[PDB]
Amino acid sequence: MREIVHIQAGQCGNQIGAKFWEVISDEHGIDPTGSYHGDSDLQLERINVYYNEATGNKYVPRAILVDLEPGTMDSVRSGPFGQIFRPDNFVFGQSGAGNNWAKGHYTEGAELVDSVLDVVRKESESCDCLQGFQLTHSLGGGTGSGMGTLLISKIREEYPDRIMNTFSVMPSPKVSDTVVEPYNATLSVHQLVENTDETYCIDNEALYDICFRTLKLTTPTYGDLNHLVSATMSGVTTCLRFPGQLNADLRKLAVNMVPFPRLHFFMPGFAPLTSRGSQQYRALTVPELTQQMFDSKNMMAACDPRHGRYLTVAAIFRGRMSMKEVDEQMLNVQNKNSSYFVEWIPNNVKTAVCDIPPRGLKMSATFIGNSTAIQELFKRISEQFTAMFRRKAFLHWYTGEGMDEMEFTEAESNMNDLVSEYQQYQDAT
Amino acid sequence: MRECISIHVGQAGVQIGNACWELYCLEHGIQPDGQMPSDKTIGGGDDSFNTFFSETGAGKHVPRAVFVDLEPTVIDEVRTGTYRQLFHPEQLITGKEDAANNYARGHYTIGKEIIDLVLDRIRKLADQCTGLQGFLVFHSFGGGTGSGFTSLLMERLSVDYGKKSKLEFSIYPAPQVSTAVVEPYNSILTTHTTLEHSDCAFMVDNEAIYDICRRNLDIERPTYTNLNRLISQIVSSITASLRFDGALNVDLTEFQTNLVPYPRIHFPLATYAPVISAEKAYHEQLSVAEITNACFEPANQMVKCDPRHGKYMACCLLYRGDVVPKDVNAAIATIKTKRSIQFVDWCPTGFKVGINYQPPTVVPGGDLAKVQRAVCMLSNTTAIAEAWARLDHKFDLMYAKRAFVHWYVGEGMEEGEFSEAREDMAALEKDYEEVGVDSVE
Amino acid sequence: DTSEKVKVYLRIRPFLTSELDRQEDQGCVCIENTETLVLQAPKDSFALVGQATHKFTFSQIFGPEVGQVAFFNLTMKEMVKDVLKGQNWLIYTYGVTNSGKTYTIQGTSKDAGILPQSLALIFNSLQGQLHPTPDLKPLLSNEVIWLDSKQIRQEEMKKLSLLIGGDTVPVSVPADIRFSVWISFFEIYNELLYDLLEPPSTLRLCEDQNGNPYVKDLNWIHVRDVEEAWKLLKVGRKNQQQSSRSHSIFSIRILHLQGEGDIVPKISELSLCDLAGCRLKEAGNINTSLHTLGRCIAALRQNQQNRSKQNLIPFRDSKLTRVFQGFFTGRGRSCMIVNVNPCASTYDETLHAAKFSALASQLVHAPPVHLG
Ligand SMILES: CC(=O)O[C@H]1C(=O)[C@@]2(C)[C@H]([C@H](OC(=O)c3ccccc3)[C@]3(O)C[C@H](OC(=O)[C@H](O)[C@@H](NC(=O)c4ccccc4)c4ccccc4)C(C)=C1C3(C)C)[C@]1(OC(C)=O)CO[C@@H]1C[C@@H]2O
Ligand SMILES: Nc1nc2c(ncn2[C@@H]2O[C@H](COP(=O)(O)OP(=O)(O)OP(=O)(O)O)[C@@H](O)[C@H]2O)c(=O)[nH]1
Ligand SMILES: Nc1nc2c(ncn2[C@@H]2O[C@H](COP(=O)(O)OP(=O)(O)O)[C@@H](O)[C@H]2O)c(=O)[nH]1
Ligand SMILES: [Mg+2]
């Protein structure tokens, strides 16, 4: 068995977690009360991946809520799926960081991290064979950055073998409502580079773009963005739970995606996506999904991949399909767009196929990209960061928390080195 | 008695095993329950042949097979599919974690503590034979268990038994189509196993079988359930002589003797002539001459290579059904007449012929037309060198920059081993080029 | 520098009587000259490539005739001088089972290895020109901590607790510089830094003002003379042929502290890193670190004046290369001590060790092979 321990921190993390658990309980046909009222037996074949068995024929997800401060606890606990979670996992403090990385890491977070570590240890001790951890948080904020990185570091120290998977929301370059995003984001990236196995860069700008242009929504809200991210995050781990012609898991993706230890920042994507009113006009074929994935406007990372080269990509398809058609389409993508792929990899594409589609679809598929163009987002943050740090705009809100100024400089340098590393592989060689 | 232990390793191995055992059960009239209605119908004979089935007291016929995946998703289908009650409960799933397309994990770290169970089960199966043996190991290069655990298992088997024929049926990487980006590493790292331990290895390539299905069978959108059926037809045709009567029965020993001129050249190609769709079954006689000529067509080969670019060092024809020696001899003479088929000057005879009276069967829901006669050709040629050269190039394009190397180094594989593996491959290629040379007087 | 690369030095261990008793001598290790080691296969007729001869370049090679002190007097004493002269130097060590690295570096008290002799030379040289008590700690190569009375007493208590609970270089400045010599000893194990001078009963990294990484909260111990340093080191050794399973780093920092109490004087650092040569986990980590290290050294050898291209030195991929980032960058320099053994049973490992650690490695093949 291959169990996953799901962790989430911050307002963004908790809301994405709520939507994700809604989607998963829909997939396995689990009632909000925790009972099962599905149809196909395959739902219970691998329900242990996410859920523990409670005595009354009941299922309880392995969710750990990190700093569910009362403002978000009241939302989650009173929501539609508030009662599914076991209350012992509702770990939280009072007087949160307030968009201050130092408070989230050193001052306030160090007081609460012990409880979360104890809960994580108790949950992990119950697994037959743990596969890895899955974290959901947001950079540029408060507790989600500081405590998120603190928990990543301590858990990875405790469980070095197991896969540390992170789904993080980057700060958008333009659409921002927080002044001190650059400092928190820079420190979080510095902590993230050395302490995770794979991190998925999500940006709100790209999700808004997809909602406005692809789905033709006029009034998108955070619910829809969480819907898209949940769809992706379910698509990634679909092969662990259901059979298929060609199986895959987290470790298999990690091996076939991370050519060097520090190059583990990815661009997620999902297909198909289209408004309801037009769904009757387009038939679902593997060519259509393949066309929609590699379209630069479907990427959730807010970065055009054509500005660089794909180090490596992976397609995880779901639904009944022929392997010849899939292989032909991926080979066609490699051959036609050969200018946008790294030359010194003979084959840049990983393929996985699951034979159980989503509930309401014949076919679906999930894309994970890894390209040097991602370096762009780091550069933008770095620019904004220096534009403040040279003036010492808000250092007194940080240095007062027992943070020497030097901790900033190191982080900045680390980010620059990361950018330089990606820039090594943009040139043909 | 004559028995063969089928071992399957990895997902490709297990699916090929499913298709193969479906074909065997259909051939011997054995139900999915293991009961055999023909036993009470005939009341005699060994039609529940010991070559693939052990008979118990209750009349149930249990397959002689063991197989591993290190990923319970694939074998649990067998444990729940229609044949769950056929196989013995000893289908060794041990996949608390997968190898994850990593040779080092399969061979050194994860594969340990499972090889003992597999060797124990194979010992228990082998103790039940009062007669001939020979292992048929199925796997896929480029994967996990199929690359590392297969090497471990071969290494242990060559010591425990040693003087037993070990036939290998391995999925090779295609020139273009690939489902992984670390495939060349895992493929190259098994060359030592395939050289030192295997007694005869049959390579197949998915792109070639796709071409055959699209062209001959008229299947626009094939999937693995058809490629496995074709490979099962091959394997059934190879082992036909051990079970059914025939004018010329070729055993495994005489089979290997006439096909492997030297110890290090045990890599024959395979092909099957009457592929033929259902609708095309009419408008063609399918005489012995036609299928014999069709076997030599480069477009019908199961490995993406061109025999015209090399010389034929050995060839073995295995016929099934309504075949008479007169037509076989005439067809062989016609083949020898043609100048497109080049034989090395040091093999004047060139042909081994085996004929069997049991015609092939058609799987229900299949796509092969019922035919009166059929032929499977195996041929040891030098053109197979091409199939290695491309792969070696791909390996170099990664290894020059040490891409993905650390994923192995952290698993206990010393780095220098990579170089050693490639060197072995290099030596193999040179050997083939040193047997296509015409003799000098 | 003049494309110094590494300037690797080689020690070849002599045979032991018990080894010759088992016919271990089959001509595995030899030398064409003092610069190029020659490694050949033993005549392994057992178990039912006749020589496979490989050549390995070294700055100097030292056969079995050369003892530990003979090794030190010819190569490393200069480097000690070079450190006290005002440079920063880092001596790596590598070898395999029976190679003699743990005797080459540490050895006994009489035929002292490079480490005790470095202690002896440095501390004997600075007698009469040292501060009697601790006054100034070498935290960094470009920063120090001045100690008040209570801090000095506490450091003395630390030194005495570690000591109790179980000859000259060109530098000669009496009455001008009250040298402050401090030592440290830790180990990198599973990418975790453990302070080792702490007596028998995890450290962090961070950068200095110039971006040079250093280790945080390292138990630097002031020392007076040779024997104090040797005893502190010996006690710290217990917290770490017999060979390491971790990368054990000893280091010494000398503050050229003028009589006025100059803050941030010239800090001279000599460090020695004993490297570990399919316990699974550590082994993979060891190989992983070594792999990264090899790449870094290869980059450091590829990025010399021979190419005039910097490319990338992947020192960030491991703790070992990150902490020694300053020596890859140019803030310091580094050399290498390789150990081998002529025993047949060691040969493959020995060969691999040379291929990992030689100044340069080449294939000769010994063309007289292919007898059959
Ligand atoms: C009725 C109708 O014509 O609309 C369909 C539908 O298929 C469309 C319009 C759906 C629909 O999605 C959206 O309108 C949407 C809006 C904002 C953000 C994301 C989606 C649909 O909501 C989504 C829903 O999809 C599912 O049921 C999948 O199983 C999906 N389920 C959920 O996301 C889910 C949502 C709430 C509660 C429980 C589950 C899923 C996808 C991936 C992985 C797991 C599950 C379907 C069939 C529809 C509607 C209902 C309109 C689309 O969505 C998905 C993710 O499939 C948008 O385009 C795709 C495909 C279709 O075009
Ligand atoms: N011809 C054929 N090839 C298959 C089949 N199933 C899987 N493969 C091939 O198997 C190769 C990779 O093997 P994997 O998917 O990794 O399975 P594995 O070899 O057991 O390795 P694991 O991932 O550890 O299970 C691919 O190139 C596939 O084409 C099949 O049913 N028929
Ligand atoms: N995608 C998404 N992002 C969100 C949501 N809510 C908040 N955010 C983002 O999260 C950031 C604020 O981080 P926050 O949760 O306050 O950090 P915290 O104070 O530690 O909890 C902002 O930049 C928002 O854009 C949400 O529901 N969905
Ligand atoms: Mg698998």
Contact B56, B50 (CB under 8 A): no
**Chain C residue nearest residue A262, CA to CA:** C317
Which of B268, B292, B325 lies at the terminal end of a domain, its last residue?
A: B268
A95 alpha carbon, closest ligand:
3
- Which atom of ligand 3 is found nearest the CA of A72? 21
| Chain C residues in contact with B410 (beta carbon < 8 A) | 284-285, 287-288
Strand partners, A5: A133
Note whether C352 contacts B414, CB cutoff 8 Å: yes
Return the structure tokens found at B231.
């490979």
Q: B179 in ligand 2 pocket by Cβ < 6 Å? A: yes
Task: Kindly give the pairing relationship between strand C53-57 and strand C360-365.
Answer: antiparallel
CA B318 to each of CA B250, B289, B424: distance values in angstroms, whole numbers, following the listed order: 8, 14, 32
B144 and B65 belong to one structural domain: yes
Nearest in space to A292 (alpha carbons), one of A238, A347, A234, A333: A333
Work out the minimum CA distance from C88 to partner chain A, whole angstroms: 23
Measured in angstroms, how far is the CA atom of residue A177 from the centroid of ligand 3?
A: 10
Find where tokens 């490979």 sit: B231
The tokens for A291 are 């066309």
Per the annotation, the verdict on B417 as an active-site residue is: no
| Sequence-separated (6 or more) residues with CB below 8 Å from residue B24 | B30, B52, B53, B63, B236
Give the residue from B320, B338, B334, B231 showing the smallest Cα distance to B290: B334
Long-range contacts of C29-37 (CB under 8 A, 24+ apart): C29/C340, C29/C341, C29/C342, C29/C350, C30/C342, C31/C61, C31/C63, C33/C61, C34/C58, C34/C60, C34/C61, C35/C59, C35/C60, C35/C61, C36/C61, C37/C10, C37/C12, C37/C61, C37/C340, C37/C354, C37/C358
Task: Report residue C284: phi and psi, to 5°.
Answer: -55, -50
Q: Give B77 Cα–ligand 2 centroid separation in angstroms.
A: 16
Name the E strands within B107-165.
135-140
Task: Give the Cα separation of B51 and B243 in Å (integer).
Answer: 7
C 332-361 → B contacts, CB under 8 A: 352, 355
C283 contacts on B by Cβ (under 8 Å): 412
Q: What is the CATH number of domain C8-365?
A: 3.40.850.10
Closest partner residue to A255 (CB to CB) among B206, B224, B407 is B407
Question: DSSP 3-state assignment of A29?
Answer: coil
Measure the CA–CA gap between B200 and B260, rounded to whole angstroms. Answer: 8
As a whole number of angstroms, the distance between CA B121 and CA B5 comes to 11
For ligand 3, mutation pick of A151, A169, A184, A230 (most atoms within 8 Å of CB):
A169
CB A373 within 8 A of CB A305: yes
* Distance, C-alpha C285 to centroid of its chain: 19
Tell me, yes or no, whether B263 and B276 share the same domain. Answer: no
Residue of the CA atom closest to atom 60 of ligand 1: A273
User: Nearest residue CA, atom 10 of ligand 2?
Assistant: B12
- This structure was determined by cryo-EM
Q: Is C17 annotated as a binding residue?
A: no
Instruction: Please tell me whether residues B132 and B231 are part of one structural domain.
Output: yes
My answer on whether B180 and B52 are in the same domain is yes
CA distance B312 to A184: 69
Q: What is the resolution of this structure in A?
A: 3.2
CA A281 from centre of chain: 32
Same domain, B104 and B128: yes
Q: Is B375 helix (H, G, I), strand (E, B) or coil?
A: strand
Nearest Cα residue to A302 out of A368, A376, A233: A376
How many CA atoms does the CB half-sphere of C155 hold within 13 Å?
Answer: 25
A143 in contact with ligand 3, CB cutoff 6 A:
yes
Contacts of A417 in chain C (CB under 8 A): 316
Residues B156 and B103 in one domain: yes
**Do B92 and B37 form a contact (C-beta atoms < 8 A)?**
no
C100 known ligand binder = yes
Q: How far is residue B160's CA from residue C238's CA, in Å, rounded to a whole number?
A: 45
Polymer length in residues for chain A: 429
Helices (H) and strands (E) in chain A, counts: 16, 11
**Which residues 6+ apart lie within 8 Å of B345 measured at CB?**
B438, B439
CB contact under 8 A, C207 and A261: no
Catalytic choice (B77, B90, B207, B254): B254
Query: Is B101 in Cβ contact with A255 (below 8 Å)?
Result: yes
Q: How far apart are CA B343 and CA B336, in angstroms?
A: 9
Query: What is the number of residues in chain C?
Result: 372
**Pair of tokens at residue C268:** 């001279």
CA distance B311 to B298: 13
Domains of chain A: 2-259 (3.40.50.1440), 260-373 (3.30.1330.20), 374-429 (1.10.287.600)
Q: Are C241 and C345 in contact (CB under 8 A)?
A: no
Do B286 and B162 share a domain, yes or no? Answer: no
What does the DSSP 8-state code read for residue A200? E
Token pair recorded at residue A109: 């977070």
CA C207 to chain B, closest CA, distance in angstroms equals 27
Distance, CA of A415 to CA of A404 (rounded, Å): 18
Which of A263, A324, A355 best tests the B interface by mutation, with the highest count of B CBs <10 A?
A324
- Say if the Cβ atoms of A249 and B183 lie within 8 Å: no
Q: How many CA atoms lie within 13 A of B421 on its CB side?
A: 24
Give the three-state DSSP class for A66.
coil
No. of helices (H) and no. of strands (E), chain B: 16, 11
Backbone angles phi, psi at B51, to 5 degrees: -65, -25
Pair B247, B391 in one domain:
no
- Domain ranges within chain C, ordered by starting residue: 8-365
Q: Is C101 annotated as a binding residue?
A: yes
Helix (H) or strand (E) holding A58: strand A58-61
CB atoms within 10 A of CB B220: 9
Q: Which of A285, A358, A353, A367 is nearest to B224 (CA)?
A: A353
Distance A132 CA to ligand 2 centre (A): 24
Number of domains observed in the structure of chain B: 3
**What does residue A203 show for φ and ψ, rounded to 5 degrees?**
-135, 135
* Pairwise CA distance, residues B406 & A249, whole Å: 19
Q: What is the C-alpha separation between A245 and A323, in angstroms, rounded? A: 9
Q: Domain span at residue B9?
A: 1-268
Distance CA C131, CA C173 (A): 12
Burial C334-359 (b: 16+ CB within 10 A, else e): bbbbbbbbbbbbbbbbbbebbbbbbb
What is the DSSP code (8-state) at residue A320? S
Question: How many CB pairs lie under 8 A apart between chains A and B?
Answer: 99
- Residue B297 CA from chain centroid, whole number: 20
Tell me the two tokens of residue B269: 């190609």
Q: Which ligand 3 atom is nearest residue A223's CA?
A: 27
Pair B301, B271: CB distance under 8 Å: yes
Q: Is A109 in the pocket of ligand 3 (CB under 6 A)?
A: no
Token pair for residue A372? 């040097």
Do the beta carbons of residue A136 and residue A20 sit within 8 Å? yes
Q: For residue A19, report the distance from its CA to the centre of ligand 1, in Å.
A: 13
Helix (H) or strand (E) holding A270: strand A265-271
CATH number of the domain enclosing B287: 3.30.1330.20
- Is residue A272 reached through a cis peptide bond, with omega within 30 degrees of 0 on the bond before it? yes
Residue A14's alpha-carbon distances to A66, A83, A284, B225, C160, in angstroms, are: 9, 15, 33, 43, 54
Determine which of C281, C312, C321, C329 to mutate to test the interface with A (most A C-beta atoms within 10 Å).
C312
Q: Which of C131, C166, C365, C361 is nearest to C255 (CA)?
A: C131
Query: Across the interface, do C207 and A410 touch by the CB < 8 Å criterion?
Result: yes
Q: Cβ distance C128 to C172 under 8 Å?
A: no
The residue out of B342, B368, B383 marking a domain boundary is B383
Using the mean position of ligand 3's atoms as its centre, give its distance from the Cα of residue A11 in Å.
Answer: 5
Tell me, letter by letter, the H, E, C secondary structure of chain C.
Answer: CCCCCCCEEEEECCCCHHHHHCCCECCCEEECCCCEEEECCCCCCCCCCCCCEEEEECCEEECCCCCHHHHHHHCHHHHHHHHHHCCCEEEEEECCCCCCHHHHHCECCCCECHHHHHHHHHHHHCCCCECCCCCEEEEECCEEEECCHHHHHHHHHHHHHHHHCCCCCCCCCCCCECEEEEEEEEEEECCEEEECCCCCCCEEEEECCCCCEEEECCCCEECCCHHHHHHHHHHHHCCCCCCCCCEEEEEEEEECCECCCCCCCCEEEEEEEECCCCCHHHHHHHHHHHHHHHHHHHHHHHCCCCCCCCCCCCHHHCHHHHHCHHHHHCCCEEEEEEEECCECCCHHHHHHHHHHHCCEEEEEECCCCCCC
| Cβ–Cβ gap B410/C287 under 8 Å | yes
Q: What are phi and psi of C303, to 5 degrees?
A: -95, 15
Question: What are φ and ψ of residue A395, in 5° steps?
Answer: -70, -30
CA B266 to chain centre: 13
Determine the distance in angstroms separating the CA of C330 from the nearest CA of chain A, rounded to an integer: 17
Q: A276: which residues sit within 8 A by CB, 6+ positions away?
A: none
CA B176 to mean position of chain CA atoms: 21
Under a CB-based contact definition with an 8 Å cutoff, are residues A264 and A196 in contact?
yes
Question: What gap in Å lies between CA B296 and CA B437, rounded to an integer?
Answer: 22
Q: What is the CA radius of gyration of chain B?
A: 21
Question: What's CA C134's distance to the chain center, in Å?
Answer: 26
Q: Are B139 and B108 in contact (CB under 8 A)?
A: no
- What does the block give as tokens for C226? 């040779």
Separation of alpha carbons A249 and A161, rounded Å: 15
**B221 and B83 in a common domain:** yes
Residue A319, helix vs strand vs coil: coil
DSSP secondary structure of A74-139: HHHHTSTTTTTS-GGGB---SS--SS-HHIIIIISHHHHHHHHHHHHHHHHHT-SSEEEEEEEEET
Identify residues of C whose CB sits under 8 angstroms from chain A CBs.
190, 206-207, 209, 211, 281, 311-312, 314, 316-317
Query: What are the phi and psi torsion angles at A232 (to 5°)?
Result: -60, -45
Same domain? B348 vs B414: no
Helical pair A181-193 and A406-424, crossing angle rounded to 10 deg: 60
**Ligand 2 pocket, B366 CB below 6 A?**
no
* DSSP 3-state of A4: strand
Query: B421 and B339 share a domain?
Result: no
In this structure, what token pair is assigned to residue B331? 């067809």
CA dist., res. A146 & res. A109, Å (int): 7
Q: Which residue of C has its CA nearest to B410?
A: C284
CA dihedral sign of residues B104, B110, B113, B114 = negative
Neighbouring residues of the ion ligand 4, judged by CB less than 5 Å: B 71, 98
A370 marked ligand binding residue: no
Please report, as a single letter, which amino acid is at residue C187: E
Rg (CA), chain C: 21
Contact A413 C211 (CB under 8 A): yes
**Does one domain contain both B352 and B404?**
no
Q: Is B116 exposed, middle or buried (0-12, 13-18, 19+ CB in 10 A)?
A: exposed
